[PDB]
Amino acid sequence: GGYLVDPQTSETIRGVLRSTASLRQIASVVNVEATSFDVLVDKTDMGS
Amino acid sequence: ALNSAVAAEGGYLVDPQTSETIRGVLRSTASLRQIASVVNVEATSFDVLVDKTDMGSGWASETAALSETATPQIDRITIPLHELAAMPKASQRLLDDSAFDIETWLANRIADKFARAEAAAFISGDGVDKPTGFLTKTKVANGAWAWGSLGYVATGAAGDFAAVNASDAVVDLVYALGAEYRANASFVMNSKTAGAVRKMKDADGRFLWAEPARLMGYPVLIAEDMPDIAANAYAIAFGDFGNGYTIAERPDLRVLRDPFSAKPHVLFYASKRVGGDVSDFAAIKLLKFAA
Amino acid sequence: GWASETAALSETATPQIDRITIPLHELAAMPKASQRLLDDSAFDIETW
Incomplete structure (x- = not known):
């Protein structure tokens, strides 16, 4: 009778869990539809 | 997620589908139950009541004063109705x-x-504790036939059929069975006797006999429990088993599961009860290979 | 014990009971x- 026992197969197959802390939640994310993105910064300030 | 053959690269996800219903070797169901008189009975024993004789007629004259005539004497045959039990x-x-x-x-x-x-x-x-089959019913040669016995015709030579006239030990067995019983009659053989019957041929090599595998127009039950062609064996029977043999039974299968005696096991106790012997001794003739 | 799927399955044991008596003495004083x-x-x- 041991041939007809047929174990179950754990309906959702799992994996090893890896951390998802990814620096996207602290940095600034910009949607871009081009080949490249720029920023325009100010390396100096004005005068008085 | 790779090829399905090797185990670690996705071979453990392949889950071989089992069959729907567990199959088995399909052993013989040609069981003589389909040709005999099967009778439901909720009792210990079944009693058929046959007529072993008949009456007399007069052709009474105009002025004769008709006397008494015969009246059939009656036999009772007691089916034992034993049980049959298996306990896996x-x-x-x-x-x-x-x-x-x-x-x-x-x-x-x-x-x-x-x-x-x-x-x-x-x-x-x-x-003893089982139905008496028709082979164990004190066979007496045909012509000298009484009611308390089954008739047979003999073939001739001891081991096999007759030498000069082979295969008419079959036909006189047919035409020595009674003209009403041959309306629905049947041969009963086993497979290696029916093969030896089919192997018989004329003087030129062609088979002289010409899915149910009937013989001379009469159906053949290929049983698996008659004896083969031995020296004094009864390998071939023929007759109207629907009148000749009476099966008495209960048409159900009593199962009791037993979780108590064998303790980690379930131990199904199943037992149907069935009995039967010959009811009409004229409706079964046999073929003996003796002389 | 875990039952060997195939076994005689004899009886395990029974918790042996025990009666502890509190004899209920008397404490007295005769000044x-x-x-x-x-x-x-x-x-x-x-x-x-």
């Missing part, structure tokens, strides 16, 4: 973890085993 | 006080 032992871990319906599979397999095991008792069974 | 120094003292020794 099945484990509780199997019955809980064995997704096939194991209980109805055992109820089918026990039923097949019983329908096959009663076929041996219907043909060659003795008296 | 023998004189009849003089119970009715000639100013302090009620009989209640003290």
Whole structure:
């Protein structure tokens, strides 16, 4: 009778869990539809 | 997620589908139950009542004063109606973890085993706790035929059929069976006797006999429990078994599961009860190979 | 024990019981006080 026992197969197959802390939640994310993105910064300030 | 052959690269996800219903070797169901008189009976014993004789007629004259005439004397045949019991032992871990319906599979397999095991008792069974088959009924040669016995015709030579006139030991067996019984009559043989019958041929090599595998227009039950062609054996029978042999039974299969005696096992106790012997001694003739 | 799927399955054991008796003794005291120094003292020794 041991041939007809047929174990179950754990309906959702799992994996090893890896951390998802990814620096996207602290940095600034910009949607871009081009080949490249720029920023325009100010390396100096004005005068008085 | 790679090729399905090697185990670690996705071979453990391949889950071989089992069959729908557990199959088995399909053993013989040609059991003489389909040709005889099967009678439901809720009792200990069944009593057929046959007429072993008949009456007399007068052709009474105009002025004769008609006297008495005969009146048929009557025989009672007691079917013993024994039981047939099988008790397989099945484990509780199997019955809980064995997704096939194991209980109805055992109820089918026990039923097949019983329908096959009663076929041996219907043909060659003795008296002790089993039905007496028609081979064990004190065979007396035909012509000197009494009611308390079965008739036979003999073939000639001891081991086999007759030398000069082979295969008419069959035809006089047919035409020595009674003109009303041949309306629905049948041969009963086993397979290696029917093969030896089919191997018979004329003086030129062609088979002289020409899915149910009937012989001379009469159907043949290929049993598996008659004797083969031995020195004084009764390998071939012929007759109207629907009148000749009476099967008495209960048409159900009593199962009791037993979780108590064998403790981690389930131990199905199944027993149907079945009996029967010959009711009409004229309706079965035999072929003896003696002389 | 875990039952070997195939086994005789004999009886395991039974918790052996035990009666512990609390014999319920008595604790008594007999101060023998004189009849003089119970009715000639100013302090009620009989209640003290």
